Amino acid sequence: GSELETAMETLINVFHAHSGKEGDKYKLSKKELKELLQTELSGFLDAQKDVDAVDKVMKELDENGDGEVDFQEYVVLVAALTVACNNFFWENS
Amino acid sequence: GSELETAMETLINVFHAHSGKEGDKYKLSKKELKELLQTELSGFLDAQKDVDAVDKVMKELDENGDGEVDFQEYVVLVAALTVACNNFFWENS
């Protein structure tokens, strides 16, 4: 819709590109989410700054991987990785 | 960067469009965030389905409004409203 809403409707397309592994099309298993995060959010992983926070999400899901997530969860985790790569705001190169 | 990452970099731009009331531009006060959500997330607000959930965020922030958020928080709340307007998944039209 608006620029913000088209940004979010993009997150839906991307979530749905990997969703359905489990059988539910609006859900994605947590271990399968790590694949999406490693594939599309790969550039933010390469640009990570908070090595603590990036791994705090990954290792946490690595053991909880056999669970699942929906769009809301997926975006929360995406945003968390995004700020772990944005913390450079306080680094005056 | 990627399709997902440009989706998220859009969320940064549009967060920044109303940010800096407190002077920090990577932050926005919570009551001031409601404005952004009412302006840009207005279409998702119009398309709301989970009336309980949409208000759970708004009424909550209306009393917690004098605090503040960053990109991570703002995106979580945006995603929460997004799923409250996506609920048609459980509506057999």
UniProtKB/Swiss-Prot annotation, chains A, B:
Keyword field contains Protease:
no
Q: How is it modified after translation?
A: Glutathionylated; glutathionylation increases affinity to calcium about 10-fold.
Chain positions with S-nitrosocysteine modification: C85
Q: Name one GO molecular function term.
A: identical protein binding
Q: How does it assemble?
A: Dimer of either two alpha chains, or two beta chains, or one alpha and one beta chain. Also forms heterodimers with S100P. Interacts with AGER. Interacts with CAPZA1. Interacts with FKBP4. Interacts with RYR1 and RYR2. Interacts with CACYBP in a calcium-dependent manner. Interacts with PPP5C (via TPR repeats); the interaction is calcium-dependent and modulates PPP5C activity. Interacts with ATP2A2 and PLN in a Ca(2+)-dependent manner. Interacts with mitochondrial F1-ATPase subunits ATP5F1A and ATP5F1B; these interactions increase F1-ATPase activity.
An additional note in the Swiss-Prot or TrEMBL entry is: Able to bind zinc in vitro; the binding sites are different from the calcium binding sites. The physiological relevance of zinc binding is unclear. Physiological concentrations of potassium antagonize the binding of both divalent cations, especially affecting the high-affinity calcium-binding sites.
Name used for this protein in its record: Protein S100-A1
Organism (species): Homo sapiens
Q: Which gene encodes it?
A: S100A1
